A paper describes a structure:
Diatoms are dominant marine algae and contribute around a quarter of global primary productivity, the success of which is largely attributed to their photosynthetic capacity aided by specific fucoxanthin chlorophyll-binding proteins (FCPs) to enhance the blue-green light absorption under water. In conclusion, the cryo-EM structures of PSII-FCPII and the trimeric FCP of C. meneghiniana provide detailed insights into the structures of various FCP antennae and the assembly of FCPs within the PSII supercomplex.
In each subunit of the Cm-FCP trimer, we assigned 8 Chls a, 3 Chls c, 7 Fxs and 1 sulfoquinovosyl diacylglycerol (SQDG) molecule. An extra Chl a412 and an SQDG molecule are inserted into the gap between helices A and C at the lumenal surface, building hydrophobic interactions and hydrogen bonds with Chls c405, Fx306 and Thr118 of B-C loop. At the stromal side, one specific Chl a402-c403-a406 cluster is located in the inner side of the trimer to hold the energy equilibrium among three monomers, and another Chl a401-c408-a407 cluster in the exterior region is responsible for EET to the PSII core or other FCP antennae. The distances among Chls a406 in the Cm-FCP05 trimer are larger than those in the Pt-Lhcf dimer; for this reason, an extra Chl a415 was found in the Cm-FCP05 trimer which may play a role in enhancing the efficient EET between the adjacent monomers. The trimeric Cm-FCP05 structure revealed in this study represents the atomic structure of FCP trimer containing a substantial amount of red Fx and Chls c, enabling the capture of blue-green light.
Numbering used by the authors:
A (entry chain C), B (entry chain A), C (entry chain B): 30 to 210
Write the structure that this text describes.
Amino acid sequence: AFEDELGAQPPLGFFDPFGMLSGDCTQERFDRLRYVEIKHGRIAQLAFLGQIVTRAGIHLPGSINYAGDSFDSFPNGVAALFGPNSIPTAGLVQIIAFIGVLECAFMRDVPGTGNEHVGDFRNGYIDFGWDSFDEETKLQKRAIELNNGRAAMMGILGLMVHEEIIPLGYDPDLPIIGHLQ
Amino acid sequence: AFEDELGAQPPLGFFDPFGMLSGDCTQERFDRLRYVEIKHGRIAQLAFLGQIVTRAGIHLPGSINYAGDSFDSFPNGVAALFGPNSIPTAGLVQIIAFIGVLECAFMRDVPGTGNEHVGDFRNGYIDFGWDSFDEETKLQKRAIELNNGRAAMMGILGLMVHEEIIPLGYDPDLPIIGHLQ
Amino acid sequence: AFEDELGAQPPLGFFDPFGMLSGDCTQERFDRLRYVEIKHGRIAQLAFLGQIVTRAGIHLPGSINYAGDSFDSFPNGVAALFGPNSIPTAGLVQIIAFIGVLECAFMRDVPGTGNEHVGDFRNGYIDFGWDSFDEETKLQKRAIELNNGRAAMMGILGLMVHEEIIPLGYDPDLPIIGHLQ
Ligand code: CLA
Ligand code: CLA
Ligand code: CLA
Ligand code: CLA
Ligand code: CLA
Ligand SMILES: CC(=O)O[C@H]1CC(C)(C)C(=C=C/C(C)=C/C=C/C(C)=C/C=C/C=C(C)/C=C/C=C(\C)C(=O)C[C@@]23O[C@]2(C)C[C@@H](O)CC3(C)C)[C@](C)(O)C1
Ligand SMILES: CC(=O)O[C@H]1CC(C)(C)C(=C=C/C(C)=C/C=C/C(C)=C/C=C/C=C(C)/C=C/C=C(\C)C(=O)C[C@@]23O[C@]2(C)C[C@@H](O)CC3(C)C)[C@](C)(O)C1
Ligand SMILES: CC(=O)O[C@H]1CC(C)(C)C(=C=C/C(C)=C/C=C/C(C)=C/C=C/C=C(C)/C=C/C=C(\C)C(=O)C[C@@]23O[C@]2(C)C[C@@H](O)CC3(C)C)[C@](C)(O)C1
Ligand code: KC2
Ligand code: KC2
Ligand code: KC2
């Protein structure tokens, strides 16, 4: 029933190993699964972009606090948030609070606002031109977003795993990023 | 749609900063939010009353356990439950278990029992004269309960925060309550 | 409304102390409660069987890891999973992952597959002769499973509690299993 929906594309086609959509699956369950997938994909895309920018030597100018701790002094990856020498835990708490504010008030599907598919958060407020695309281009853009989200999920998982196994003696020379210092 | 519901009163009027009720919000969502708000308000009202009673020098006679630890020997506030010198953790576990029993079996809205609004737990069992009030007085009492609950929420949060910041060097002479010892 | 359902049998008859099904309870609720009860009963039955098999001196041949830690060297009970000398935590993680796979993909009620009652996971895939039983025997087997599950919940809770109180000085001689070692 959902074998022709968004995300079922070559080469795997419809790929449901654990059988989440097996049987008479309702549209609500598939919508929930797709919403979770798109949320994770967007978060992982942002996380991978941030990891790449930080590890490329690009940091915000100035200091993260009044103490004088410069931005380009904390490590990259998990050590930047959780570790002995990381950003102040007040900064992490404020970041989490800001994310919670965004999810409660901003990053949400407001009912009766014109959203036309799962993951559409425009709510009639912010729109950069989601009407010039025809029917096929809209689906193509949504598929690009979803697949990039899946790839970024796997990539950010690999980045954290590799950053967390270096102390244990597993420090390989990764193809593009090199040694994950 | 919910701008004339209970709790929308001067001077703020309908106050929805995060936009929980924005768009075509369903009655179920508002009912859930109001239930959570009323439950928090009742819990916070009881917490503030107990905090004030304990800090005023009023304690239960006798001892909290067979060891001989008198009631008027444990500290006030968070230090009474979580700390080196607090009430026995068996007492805390029993309190939590009793609260769970009350909330699962007693402090609940039993379906098909005559409850009139969200937060009504009478269930046709305990009633002190609710039907004696006319229509306007019922709404007035409900609004009083809700607003006292909000105020007690903020007050108990402030009391806990002030208690927890005294060891950090923040010990102000709070109004009325004085130094929060 | 639910006083004649499965599980309401002599000598207690219908037994709802906390009043979960009080008032106009929906089948849905009751269905969720029965599903949770059956899941807990099956898990506890397996747990009790494993506890008995391990404590009777029956262990898998060989070693649990490449290091050489033989199966018949770890303790019995909670000490086998959580403790200083337990099975490798990699094994525990893999067991939890396998259980999660089973619940997500295998041990579930697939909609539109022919399941007749709550707890039926056949899904038209695995069946050892369920339709061979007549109506009375089907209910009898379901009641036997449910009551054995309840008894197993009590038994596994008692076994874990008795294991955890031996270091505290409470080491009684249990009737059948004797001392827990
Ligand atoms: C948050 C993660 C997440 C979620 C919720 C989904 C959700 C979905 N994906 Mg999907 N996907 C993801 C990540 C995710 N994806 C990633 C990272 C990739 C890249 C490898 C893909 C690649 C992918 C393809 C190629 C396809 C889908 C499809 C689908 C849809 C139907 C199949 C399904 O339920 O997924 C699969 C099942 C799950 C995600 C269930 C969750 C299982 C997790 C892992 C929990 C298990 C825990 C347990 C301990 C197991 C761990 C050990 C285990 C590894 C052995 C559904 C909307 C199909 C689709 O669009 O059909 C319309 C489809 O063809 N996905
Ligand atoms: C998962 C997302 C994520 C997370 C958790 C972090 C976390 C962190 N980043 Mg970071 N970053 C990210 C994405 C992320 N980043 C992206 C995508 C970029 C590229 C622009 C950067 C660029 C960046 C730099 C240049 C620096 C950090 C730094 C830091 C650290 C200090 C916090 C800070 O100053 O933030 C700064 C955050 C930014 C400059 C950009 C954040 C943008 C977020 C992701 C927006 C997403 C939500 C947004 C409101 C959606 C808008 C929708 C639209 C319709 C309006 C902290 C560990 C600093 C540090 O100490 O390095 C070690 C630092 O110097 N980051
Ligand atoms: C448990 C807390 C709680 C809950 C669930 C509600 C729920 C509600 N309140 Mg309410 N209120 C509360 C506490 C709460 N209140 C307190 C303590 C006060 C006193 C300041 C008020 C004062 C108040 C007024 C004056 C009014 C309401 C109204 C309402 C209703 C619609 C607006 C709304 O959703 O609330 C606001 C939104 C929320 C509570 C969403 C939750 C947000 C929390 C903070 C989670 C965010 C976490 C995240 C990390 C952010 C933290 C950082 C942030 C501070 C920057 C709704 C039933 C309105 C009403 O009755 O209209 C009919 C109205 O006019 N409230
Ligand atoms: C959030 C609520 C709350 C919590 C968590 C506590 C927690 C605590 N109180 Mg306390 N207290 C409370 C409210 C609360 N109190 C209120 C409202 C009062 C005023 C009557 C008191 C008066 C009080 C005294 C006098 C003493 C404590 C003490 C204590 C400590 C030992 C436990 C004990 O003996 O309780 C005793 C609890 C009570 C005597 C009253 C509890 C009443 C609860 C809130 C009833 C709420 C549910 C109720 C059944 C609903 C009825 C519905 C109706 C339709 C029937 C412990 C830290 C003792 C201590 O060691 O101090 C350090 C102590 O001496 N409290
Ligand atoms: C709650 C269930 C449960 C849990 C958590 C454990 C946990 C453990 N058992 Mg154990 N065991 C169980 C039930 C359980 N057992 C049952 C029911 C039996 C009887 C067959 C055994 C027999 C057993 C032996 C003989 C040994 C262990 C051992 C161990 C330990 C190492 C893991 C291992 O090798 O497992 C091995 C697990 C098994 C051999 C049987 C597991 C069977 C599970 C319960 C299947 C349930 C799901 C199933 C796929 C449903 C099928 C549905 C059907 C339609 C297809 C670990 C602490 C070993 C150890 O080190 O002891 C200290 C060891 O030597 N167990
Ligand atoms: C106006 C304003 O303020 O905002 C607007 C701005 C703007 C532009 C309009 C907007 C937008 C669109 C945005 C931001 C789109 C962002 C898209 C984004 C950020 C997409 C990331 C993909 C990452 C992938 C696929 C990673 C794969 C990673 C993979 C496949 C790996 O395996 C990683 C690998 O890594 C390892 C593990 C090891 C290495 O050896 C090898 C490599 C490296 C391969 C918004 C949303 O509207 C907000
Ligand atoms: C028969 C039986 O057994 O039970 C029956 C008995 C009875 C009586 C019939 C029943 C009842 C009704 C009850 C119990 C009603 C209780 C109502 C209650 C307990 C209402 C508290 C409000 C607290 C507020 C507003 C606090 C604000 C606190 C604020 C605004 C603060 O900012 C606190 C501030 O603190 C700081 C932070 C710092 C200080 O510098 C300044 C102050 C102090 C201002 C029940 C429920 O039916 C149960
Ligand atoms: C083909 C394949 O691969 O799989 C198939 C195989 C097969 C056979 C077909 C299948 C099946 C059916 C199965 C596995 C059924 C299993 C049923 C099972 C395992 C039922 C346990 C009850 C335990 C109880 C009641 C414990 C009570 C414990 C009580 C009442 C206590 O108080 C314990 C007490 O302990 C203390 C606390 C202290 C002691 O002093 C005294 C005692 C000991 C009394 C499946 C499911 O289809 C899977
Ligand atoms: C996530 C988005 C975000 C938002 C929306 C946001 C809003 C505000 C507002 C307005 C409401 C104020 C007034 C304010 C003030 C301060 N912020 Mg924010 N802040 C955010 C993020 C961070 C991070 C990541 C850090 C940080 C810090 C500080 C410090 C330094 C304190 C100190 O130096 O003692 C002060 C005074 C740093 C820190 O807390 O250091 C301990 C630091 O790491 N902030 N901040
Ligand atoms: C929340 C409501 C509540 C209920 C409904 C409730 C019911 C029962 C029942 C009947 C079912 C019994 C039989 C019972 C027995 C004991 N209780 Mg309760 N008890 C409640 C609360 C507390 C608190 C707060 C404390 C406490 C204690 C003890 C001790 C002392 C043990 C010891 O001295 O060794 C014993 C023997 C104190 C404590 O456990 O200290 C270690 C203590 O702090 N209890 N208690
Ligand atoms: C729950 C069911 C379950 C499944 C479905 C499952 C599947 C696989 C697969 C195929 C996907 C492989 C390839 C694989 C391989 C290894 N397993 Mg599994 N394994 C399961 C259970 C356990 C337990 C309980 C333990 C264990 C272990 C090992 C070790 C030893 C590593 C070492 O000696 O360094 C290796 C190499 C032991 C352990 O990890 O000890 C550190 C141990 O305790 N495994 N295992």
